Ligand binder design. Structure first.
Ligand code: F3S
Length: 66
């Protein structure tokens, strides 16, 4: 059981998360990312989740595990 969170404070709109996991993130008009509706990570996107997290230069992405 995974969900994804973007910390707006840390986020500087690099947009790596979006490029890697389009299904998981949306950017606002100003370039910042935020989790898509559900937030829950589908089984086929679990690797892209950790990948986006690993890839954020600002360490702005959080993944919770239950
Ligand atoms: S800085 Fe922001 S746009 Fe994505 S890659 Fe990191 S959360």
């Amino acid at each position: 059981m995974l969900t994804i969170h973007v910390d707006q404070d840390k986020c500087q709109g690099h947009a790596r998360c979006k490029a890697l996991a389009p299904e998981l993130f949306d950017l606002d008009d100003y370039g910042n990312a935020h989790e898509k509706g559900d937030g829950v990570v589908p089984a086929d996107l679990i690797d892209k989740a950790w990948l986006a997290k690993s890839n954020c230069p600002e360490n702005a992405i959080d993944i919770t595990e239950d």
